[PDB]
């Protein structure tokens, strides 16, 4: 149940072999994340600083709880 990476459209658009496993293509941990209870301003600041469209939200143990996107804002 541990968050070991994230795979988005950019990674997959440049790959031709569709049979390849996700572990070979994904952006591996550590990721840019935030804790549960992160404010909207802080989340958008983290998104804009690291020039990424997605921000996973994790609990105290690091297991994934949610996801915040720039598209929603």
The binding site consists of 8-11, 27, 32, 53-54, 69, 71-72
One of 22, 53, 59, 63 touching ligand ATP (CB under 6 A): 53
Closest distance of CB 43 from ligand ATP, Å: 11
Omega into 30 within 30° of 0, i.e. cis?
yes
Which positions from 7 through 36 interact with Mg ion, judged by CB under 5 A? 9
Q: Rounded to whole angstroms, how far apart are CA atoms 41 and 25? A: 31
**Structure tokens, 35:** 């804790």
Residues that bind ligand ATP (CB under 6 A): 6, 8-11, 27, 31-32, 52-56
């Amino acid at each position: 149940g541990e968050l070991v990476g994230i795979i988005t459209n950019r990674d997959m658009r440049f790959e031709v072999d569709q049979s390849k496993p996700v572990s070979e293509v994904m952006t591996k941990a550590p990721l840019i994340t935030a804790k549960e209870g992160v404010s909207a301003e802080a989340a958008l600041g983290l998104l804009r600083r690291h020039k990424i469209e997605k921000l996973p939200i994790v609990d105290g143990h690091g297991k994934l709880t949610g996801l915040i996107t720039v598209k929603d804002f």
